[PDB]
Design a protein around this nucleic acid. Structure first.
Length: 798
RNA sequence: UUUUUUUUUU
């Protein structure tokens, strides 16, 4: 049971400062008595660090059974692993972190810190989480997509483990007080788990009072002249406000060190905030990064916009947009908490006391605001067929769940309309750590040696804000030259000719290749307008994407430039990934459509993005990565599609009239199926598409054509020897002068009975009984031949 | 056709 730690005297006093220590036996008694415990403790409560220690003291860690702790951030995983390992007297062999592309875990590991996504991937490998006896899910109040999928899954895992008489304990740790979606949720936890509230210790003063930027300049002005020396933090909506206020404040200046903070800021400039100020007071203009991501020790006065920037996905169109709205009360309070963490602090809210009540208490969960295809593909891999049966803490919209299954079926991830389970292709995609669209690109890309190219493109698309912003006399020319420098570079990476057809996606590839060519130089990144932090993240992601692919397909990471054929094959892999994102140029009217494109998903005209390399080229068909609305509805991530590609690449999105007699249907040896040329038209828009070789539609005519090719020996080459001796032509399966011939019906009926319209279908039928078509096939040969046929009847080897 | 990303987990 009990396990020692050997506390050092100096860390003892610190540890005793935190409040949760008093309630240790209370939390440990709850954990023993209940299967699931919810621990609610504000920042500084020390719950995250100490609760794994308590359970370690109670002996939950063991050989097969360890304590796990899941976190939203990578940083919080590693940092927490280190702090606990030092707060206890234990090696990082015992207390470890696992994050995306780094590791710390050993058989010695008894407390494991991890990101929520890492736990999900373990749930894929073993759904029972046998290697865990306790799982702690921390920062549940953040309600990230992975916390939600984890909480719903673990309720089932806890149940499955319990009936196996191997109890798994789940502890849910929340900084905020409200857990209604957990306690009141009948589907998630049939019995409301006990809720433990831990108080913690530096009070925050809140002051209530068109453009939030102006008042903030005033507030920062008024505070600074008036109040004692202490850190100033201002929350602003976006980067340009941050820069507008910093330059404005620098112009304004007794002491003041002005530092702008935003997530994409260069890590060097970022770091300036934490270090204390050089007769100069600290005032930092920041986005939400200061609210959670960064903790600034010297801050004593915060000024609050009252406004957040968020990204909204339109379900009908699929389109994304960036809008500014009122903060949540919890976001408003948490921003205030930043003010007074190591001294009494001041929060001045630029909204009225009345406005604060108008705020939505809790921000909407991140799952409801975005496509959920990645999760459902994960859920389908765990055999969760009925998505609505899943116990979402907050369920996503119906249209969101229906859209996802439509996309995942369209990629081939989910089979077949009564149900759609994961496919073999869908199962291997589930392993890849990227969105299922790019996941299919990866699975599709295992050919022509462009796999590292596609891995690089996908990695460059998955990363956010690849290119440095560089926006908003002699100083303007320095900045303006940089833009022309980066634009010229973007064009240089994307060649002219077939290379330019890959467009923006080629520009990402050429950016990744050029960066790796210079050994990912920070000098190179600043020279060519690439972002250094993003480029490193690109490199790490390519590594993890390359290792994952090797698991699926047994077979030099930093690459060499592609040949023209490779670039066009890259175009086809990308178009197949982005099938739902196809636009056609308009030619015929309204002045709004002069250079526009039309996409079936939305009525409005869409345009190539002005910074895109395909902007002036304006090809007739493109696939876009995403559509973002600002002033117009713009296509970003654009690549060219050759119109004839569409039916062979995106057959699910097309509608074919009838199979064509000219050219006549053929048999495909690789597929094992009947092919035919079919004319097609895109589903909602009505775009005419040429006739191309496509699989023959399922139907009674398909069986006839397959039966013809089988008798000719094309389907199975063992039967090909007999083709000379057949009594009537194989052609009589389609049409015959001998109407009363029974030969053709008997073969066709037997084929229908076993749904044998393909090599794989018939080969399957021969497993269930290997003499399946023997009688019927013999009907087509003279009797003397029958015995030799039966002797080698399976016309398949193996 | 003319560029206006908040924040983060595999």
């Amino acid at each position: 049971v009990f396990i020692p730690v050997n506390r050092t005297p100096e860390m003892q006093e610190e540890r005793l400062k935190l409040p949760i220590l008093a309630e240790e036996q209370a939390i440990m008694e709850a954990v023993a008595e209940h299967p699931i415990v919810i621990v609610c403790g504000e920042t500084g409560s020390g719950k995250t660090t100490q609760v794994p220690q308590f359970l370690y003291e109670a002996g939950y860690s063991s050989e097969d059974s360890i304590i796990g702790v899941t976190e939203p951030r990578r940083v919080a995983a590693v940092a927490m692993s280190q702090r606990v390992a030092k707060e206890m007297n234990l090696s990082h062999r015992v207390v470890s972190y696992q994050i995306r592309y780094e590791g710390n875990v050993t058989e010695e590991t008894r407390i494991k810190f991890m990101t929520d996504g890492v736990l999900l991937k373990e749930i894929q490998k073993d759904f029972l989480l046998l290697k865990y006896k306790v799982v702690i899910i921390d920062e549940a109040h953040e309600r990230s997509v992975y916390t939600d999928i984890l909480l719903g899954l673990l309720s089932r895992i806890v149940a499955l483990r319990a009936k196996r008489h191997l109890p798994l304990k789940l502890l849910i740790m929340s900084a905020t007080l409200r857990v209604e979606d957990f306690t009141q949720n009948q589907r998630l936890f049939t019995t409301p788990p006990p809720v433990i509230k831990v108080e913690s210790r530096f009070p925050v003063t809140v002051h209530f009072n068109d453009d939030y930027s102006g008042e903030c300049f005033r507030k920062v002005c008024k505070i600074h002249r008036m109040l004692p020396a202490g850190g100033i933090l201002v929350f602003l909506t976006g980067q340009a406000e941050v820069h507008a206020l910093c330059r404005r404040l620098r112009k304004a200046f007794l002491p003041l060190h002005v530092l702008p903070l935003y997530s994409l800021l260069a890590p060097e400039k970022q770091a300036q905030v934490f270090k204390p100020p050089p007769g100069t007071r600290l005032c930092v203009v920041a986005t939400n990064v200061a609210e959670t991501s960064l903790t600034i020790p010297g801050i004593k006065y915060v000024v609050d916009c009252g406004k957040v920037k968020k990204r909204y996905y339109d379900r009908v169109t699929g389109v994304s947009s960036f809008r500014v709205t009122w903060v949540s009360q919890a976001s408003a309070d948490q921003r205030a908490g930043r003010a007074g963490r190591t001294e009494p602090g001041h929060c001045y809210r630029l909204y009225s006391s009345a406005v604060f009540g108008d705020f939505e208490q809790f921000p909407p969960p991140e799952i409801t605001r975005r496509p959920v295809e990645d999760l459902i593909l994960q859920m389908k891999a765990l055999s969760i067929e009925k998505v609505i049966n899943f116990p979402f803490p907050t369920p996503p919209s119906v249209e969101a769940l229906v859209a996802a299954e439509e996309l995942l079926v369209a990629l081939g991830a989910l089979q077949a309309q009564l149900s759609c389970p994961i496919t073999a292709l869908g199962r291997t995609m589930s392993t890849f750590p990227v969105a299922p669209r790019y996941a299919k690109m990866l699975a599709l890309s295992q050919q022509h040696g462009c796999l590292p190219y596609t891995i690089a493109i996908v990695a460059a698309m998955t990363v956010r804000e690849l290119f440095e912003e560089l926006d908003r006399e002699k100083e303007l020319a320095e900045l303006k030259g940089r833009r022309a420098r980066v634009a010229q570079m973007k064009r240089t990476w994307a060649g002219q000719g077939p290379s330019l057809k890959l467009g923006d996606l080629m520009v990402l590839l050429g950016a990744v290749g050029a960066c790796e060519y210079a050994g990912c130089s920070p000098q190179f990144c600043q020279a060519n307008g690439l972002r250094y932090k993003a480029m490193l993240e690109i490199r790490r992601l390519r590594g993890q994407l390359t290792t994952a692919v090797n698991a699926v397909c047994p077979e030099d990471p930093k690459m060499q430039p592609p040949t023209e054929s490779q670039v066009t094959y890259l175009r086809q892999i990308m178009a197949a990934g982005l099938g739902d994102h196809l636009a056609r140029r308009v030619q015929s009217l309204d002045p709004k459509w002069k250079n526009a494109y039309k996409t079936p998903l939305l009525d409005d005209p869409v345009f190539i993005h002005p910074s895109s390399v395909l902007f002036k080229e304006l090809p007739e068909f493109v696939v876009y990565q995403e559509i973002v609305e600002t002033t117009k509805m713009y296509m970003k991530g654009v690549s060219t599609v050759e119109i004839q590609w569409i039916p062979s690449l995106l057959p699910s999105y097309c509608q074919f009239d009838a199979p064509l007699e000219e050219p006549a249907p053929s048999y495909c040896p690789e597929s094992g199926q009947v092919l035919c040329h079919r004319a097609s038209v895109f589903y909602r828009v009505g775009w005419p598409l040429p006739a191309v070789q496509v699989d023959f539609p399922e139907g009674i005519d398909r069986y006839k054509y397959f039966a013809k090719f089988l008798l000719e020996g094309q389907v199975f080459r063992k039967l090909a020897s007999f083709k000379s001796c057949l009594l009537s032509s194989p052609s009589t399966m389609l049409k015959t002068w001998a109407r009363l011939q029974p030969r053709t019906e008997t073969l066709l009926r037997a084929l229908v009975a076993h749904k044998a319209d393909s090599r794989d279908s018939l080969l399957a039928a021969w497993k269930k009984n290997p003499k399946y078509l023997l009688a019927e096939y013999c009907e087509w040969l003279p009797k003397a031949m029958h015995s030799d046929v039966e002797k080698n009847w399976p016309p398949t080897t193996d």
